[PDB]
Design a protein around this nucleic acid. Structure first.
Ligand SMILES: N#C[C@]1(COP(=O)(O)OP(=O)(O)OP(=O)(O)O)/C(=C\F)[C@@H](n2cnc3c(=O)[nH]c(N)nc32)C[C@@H]1O
Ligand SMILES: [Mg+2]
Lengths: 553, 406
DNA sequence: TCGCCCCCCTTCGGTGCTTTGCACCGAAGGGGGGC
């Protein structure tokens, strides 16, 4: 039925009128199919016939439903959506089974023809017009407009969600000891009542929904575990994901690799250790979804690893609010991190991974801090609190980082866990110049118009060097000059540059970079025993800086 | 009461800022706060056809253990018409920054007795989230003048003038300045005496509807040069580069003869002696940096800017300016929690302190340039915020070219 | 040949800098998943 709920008033964007678009696949099979669907919808008052005074139009089609033997109707409202007003969407995220508390009695229900049970605002119906053709164009055709929320319209989800919230709120206020998870038309209902009483509250809820025009078909009424919910299976003690099948191909296209990575990311919420970095690499610099991409050797190994992980059975557990949340992170290499969130050992609530490269130059301590921040945010979303962390970084390392790094940084209460490889600083710049170490006055210049540059140095012990550079930039020349000093110096070096840019990168102790030049500098800094890096202003005749300045001309 | 007609600035739409995740404690507090204000008609439940949104969260002080709801109307305030153009704004008194003590009182609740132009209310929408997205967001919009909206003090202007009218003449040497939802009230009495007069004001205010600041201890910290007897090449290189930067601020600063001292390709640990011609140069530059810079005056029509640097072991230097290198004020903030472990908490506290000083001194907050990653700041700052206002800020990654301010 | 939401990975283009490329950041493309 159609809810007696009040309509939500909706507008078109200011200045815009309604859609006016002609009709497609005018077949006879389709036409007769369409008049068949519409006449039943019309009998229930979901749509109404309209005539030619309504100038607007939009085209129609239909696809299949997962629940076999039902078709789904869809109208291509792409044009109307452009002209319809903006909405503030109230679905702020996706419920996760790890956020659920164990319940004595659980029910999963769904509303039938959900959108078609919510009326659409009177004044807006005329824009949802669609003509049904006539016999492959012989005559003018049959027109309808929607009286309810149409599938395919931009505002339908939000207006339904809001309507469902209004309808349930009476029942929610009344039964606070009944958890109701409301995701679109899908309702999860858990309680600590004994089954007999729980069932009373259920049909009390169902009867409340029906007064407001929401049917709950038996077909979609789950009374017994395992419950199918949001892509998972809910058991009393644990939850699984519904089986994830990865593509198996002899020859992979870009688009199949995109599909593979997406499945693996979905799997990583409970399957620990998933990696996609070498598989995602394949996607770079590509130019067509149909482009066949040969898997690198590294991508084959990564997929093989993932495939062995996915062959083993895993489950998550449910949330106990009387115990602390614990988050443990492990480093996986090449900027990849994996984590598990649990409350008792070896009983994960969920897992996950972090593998984004933020910035052109970074280090493991920064990325660890970003992983912690991602986990901290996720835990707020699911459980409303952050967890206590178990991290593979020593207190000496962290304390060395935030005393020598100029930006404020922080990590919550955490406990060192010895799960190598540990997160470490791979070098530390001396706070003071080194006695006995050679001093290099480095500098490099490039001509902005020329493409040509030089990099070189002058040293207190008397050494000089210039290297010509082609197809370079000014900032590259300066990195190149530091690169030479580190290359031609011993285990202990003092370096003077006039590049605030280069100093800025290096003083942040990066251990990885998108630049191969910065990557080379890092490899050298790690081989050194002591490095002091000092800056001076250029073109002010400083002894040494001026010397190399003059030389690199 | 009649509504004042309010408008957004030409060619601007209302805020469309997503709500961020909140802890259980804050969601519960926001729901108990919003359920009651709905009941008192101060806010109305709305749906998704309102396309605007502004983040909401909650703050709890440890001198006031009750939750205070805070709607981050920074975007809305930016897009709201100016009220100085309409001559409803508040003039700043130059007298406050001189007073012995300044107390801050949250009088935001007074705005809840004046309705908001119904055509403007839609711009005030906000959305309460839910733990584990058990439900969709619940949306409200204001019917009264909202706390945190810059138009609320302007519209309530001539009403607040009436409320304080008696207290002002009965105490003509106390100075009151309203900034947003706050009253900054300062006087020259004994703290005990002063506090007493505050409760008087409180109770007078209470009839209709944190900690003591002390402006005269906000010492400026200048650019100081080290004092040594033996100078290494590196020591002089740092000094030269430090005074070279300062020549963009101060005037008549020289490196002519300190730069001469580095002549040659010298080792950085070699102790070069100091000529008379260069020793004169330094002590000359020392005094120029002792007493402040001539020619820098506040411009009320330009924005205030604040830069902060982490100096370590709990110390934070800051400079407030409008034009670069023309600082109206330089300073050094210091921590207070007894563990010295949390950089983000310290920076958050430093921002509130600096912003408070700007309100006391100039009557508006600066736009902050924060030495922190965006995602680290956003992960934690709300846990330490205690002000009813929120300043503008942006995120910088500027390595210390020199330790100028330390 | 449709809608709305969250996630990840890649690409692209706008912004500001006492710049001339560079680093940052948000949006948009693809994929996963939900209904
Ligand atoms: N509300 C609601 C439902 C429930 O969709 P759901 O699977 O529960 O089916 P149903 O309610 O229509 O009826 P049923 O439950 O089978 O008896 C939807 C989400 F939740 C909407 N929706 C789902 N998928 C699609 C889709 O691809 N395209 C579009 N454009 N819209 C969709 C319409 C539907 O109304
Ligand atoms: Mg349904």
């Amino acid at each position: 039925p159609i809810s007696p709920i009040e309509t939500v008033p909706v507008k078109l964007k200011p200045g815009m009128d309604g859609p006016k678009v002609k009709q497609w696949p005018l077949t006879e099979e389709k036409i007769k199919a369409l008049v068949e669907i519409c006449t039943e919808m019309e009998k229930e008052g979901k749509i109404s016939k309209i005539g030619p005074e309504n100038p607007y139009n939009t085209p129609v089609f239909a696809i299949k439903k997962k629940d076999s033997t039902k078709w789904r109707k869809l109208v291509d409202f792409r044009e109307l959506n452009k002209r319809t007003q903006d909405f503030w969407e109230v679905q702020l995220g996706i419920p996760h089974p790890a956020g659920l508390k164990q319940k004595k009695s659980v029910t999963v229900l769904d509303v039938g023809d959900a959108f078609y049970s919510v009326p659409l605002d009177k004044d807006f119906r005329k824009y949802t017009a669609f003509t049904i053709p006539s016999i492959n164009n012989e005559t003018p055709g049959i027109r309808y407009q929607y009286n309810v929320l149409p599938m395919g319209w931009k505002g339908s989800p939000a207006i339904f969600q809001s309507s469902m919230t209004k309808i349930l709120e009476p029942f929610r206020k009344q039964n606070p000891d009944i958890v109701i998870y409301q995701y679109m038309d899908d309702l999860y209902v858990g309680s600590d009542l004994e089954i007999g009483q729980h069932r009373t509250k259920i049909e009390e809820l169902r009867q409340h929904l029906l007064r407001w025009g929401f049917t709950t078909p038996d077909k979609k009424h789950q009374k017994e575990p395992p419950f199918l919910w949001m892509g998972y299976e809910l058991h009393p003690d644990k939850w699984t994901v519904q089986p994830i099948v990865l593509p198996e191909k002899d020859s992979w296209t870009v688009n199949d690799i995109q599909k593979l990575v997406g499945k693996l990311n979905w799997a990583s919420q409970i399957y620990a250790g998933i990696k996609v970095r070498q598989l995602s690499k394949l996607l770079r610099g590509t130019k067509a979804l149909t482009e066949v991409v040969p898997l690198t050797e590294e991508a084959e190994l990564e997929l093989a690893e993932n495939r062995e992980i996915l062959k083993e059975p895993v489950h998550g557990v449910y949330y106990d609010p009387s115990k602390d949340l614990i988050a443990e992170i492990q480093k996986q290499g090449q900027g990849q991190w994996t984590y598990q969130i649990y409350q008792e050992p070896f009983k994960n609530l969920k897992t996950g991974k972090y593998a984004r490269m933020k910035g052109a130059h970074t280090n493991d301590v920064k990325q660890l801090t970003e992983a912690v921040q991602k986990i901290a945010t996720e835990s707020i979303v699911i459980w409303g609190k952050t967890p206590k962390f178990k991290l593979p970084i020593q207190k000496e390392t962290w304390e060395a980082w935030w005393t020598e790094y100029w930006q404020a940084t922080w990590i919550p209460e955490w406990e060192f866990v010895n799960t190598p490889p540990l997160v470490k600083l791979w070098y530390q710049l001396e706070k003071e110049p080194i006695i006995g170490a050679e001093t290099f006055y480095v500098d490099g210049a490039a001509n902005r118009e020329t493409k040509l540059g030089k990099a070189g140095y002058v040293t207190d012990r008397g050494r000089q060097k210039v290297v010509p550079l082609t197809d370079t930039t000014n900032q590259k020349t300066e990195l190149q000059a530091i690169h030479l000093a580190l290359q031609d110096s011993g285990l202990e070096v003092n370096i003077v540059t006039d590049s605030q840019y280069a100093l800025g990168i290096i003083q942040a102790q990066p251990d990885k970079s998108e630049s191969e030049l910065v990557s080379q500098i890092i490899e050298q800094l790690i081989k050194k025993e002591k490095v002091y890096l000092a800056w001076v202003p250029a073109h002010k005749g400083i002894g040494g800086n001026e010397q190399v300045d003059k030389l690199v001309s | 009461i009649e509504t004042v007609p309010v408008k957004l600035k030409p060619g601007m739409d209302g805020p469309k800022v997503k709500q961020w995740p909140l802890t259980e404690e804050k969601i519960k507090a926001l729901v108990e706060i919003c359920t009651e204000m709905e009941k008192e008609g101060k806010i109305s439940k709305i749906g998704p056809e309102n396309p605007y949104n502004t983040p909401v969260f909650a703050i709890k002080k440890k001198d006031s253990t009750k939750w205070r709801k805070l709607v981050d109307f920074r975007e809305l305030n930016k897009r709201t018409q100016d009220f100085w153009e309409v001559q409803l704004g508040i003039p700043h008194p130059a007298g406050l920054k001189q007073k012995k003590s300044v107390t801050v009182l949250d009088v935001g609740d007074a705005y809840f007795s004046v309705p908001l132009d119904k055509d403007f209310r839609k711009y005030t929408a906000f959305t309460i989230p839910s733990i584990n997205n058990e439900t969709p967001g619940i949306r409200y919009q204001y019917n009264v003048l909202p706390q945190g909206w810059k138009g609320s003090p302007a519209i309530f202007q001539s009403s607040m003038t009436k409320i304080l009218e008696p207290f002002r003449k009965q105490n003509p040497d106390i100075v009151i300045y309203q900034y947003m939802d706050d009253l900054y009230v300062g006087s020259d009495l004994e703290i005990g005496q002063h506090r007493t007069k505050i409760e008087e004001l409180r109770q007078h205010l209470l009839r209709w509807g944190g900690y003591e600041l002390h402006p005269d201890k906000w010492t400026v910290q200048p650019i100081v040069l080290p004092e040594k007897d033996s100078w290494t090449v590196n020591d002089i290189q740092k000094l030269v580069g430090k005074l070279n930067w300062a020549s963009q601020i101060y005037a008549g600063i020289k490196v002519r003869q300190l730069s001469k001292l580095l002549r040659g390709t010298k080792a950085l640990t070699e102790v070069v002696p100091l000529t008379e011609e260069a020793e004169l140069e330094l002590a000359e530059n020392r005094e120029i940096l002792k007493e402040p810079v001539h020619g820098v005056y506040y411009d009320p029509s330009k924005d205030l800017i604040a830069e902060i640097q982490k100096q370590g072991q709990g110390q934070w230097t800051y400079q407030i300016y409008q034009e670069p290198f023309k600082n109206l004020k330089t300073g050094k903030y210091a921590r207070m929690k007894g563990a010295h472990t949390n950089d983000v908490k310290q920076l958050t506290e430093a921002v509130q302190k600096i912003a408070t000083e700007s309100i006391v001194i100039w009557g508006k907050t600066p736009k902050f340039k924060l030495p922190i990653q965006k995602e680290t700041w956003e992960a934690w700052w709300t846990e330490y915020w205690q002000a009813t206002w929120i300043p503008e800020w942006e995120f910088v990654n500027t390595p210390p070219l020199v330790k100028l301010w330390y």
